[PDB]
């Protein structure tokens, strides 16, 4: 049967990025906050 538009899943909103990029966003989000905390430690 020639397919029509397939049904998107409930997690189809994050489709235009790979899972690795969303993962590398979060690990970027953590360490930058750690840097901001550590710069704020060694500075008045």
């Amino acid at each position: 049967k020639k397919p029509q538009k397939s049904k998107p899943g409930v997690f189809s909103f994050l489709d235009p990025l790979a899972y690795e990029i969303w993962m590398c966003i979060v690990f970027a989000y953590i360490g930058v906050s750690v840097v901001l905390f550590l710069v704020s430690r060694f500075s008045p």
């Binding site: 049904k7 899943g9 189809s12 909103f13």
Partner: protein, 49 residues
């Protein structure tokens, strides 16, 4: 006697061309995009609620 000039062949051109076509005629401009469904963005609400 049929195959030497293609009475088998040339008639197979015609009867396979005759009944209409369903090809690249409707892949190009027989679509307009629609509004988004809620189901396109439903899982955000599941993340939201």
């Amino acid at each position: 006697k049929l195959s030497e000039q293609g009475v088998l062949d040339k008639l197979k051109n015609k009867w396979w061309y005759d009944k209409g076509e369903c090809g690249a005629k409707d892949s190009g401009s027989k679509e307009k995009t629609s509004a988004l469904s809620l189901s396109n963005v439903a899982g955000v609400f599941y993340i939201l609620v």
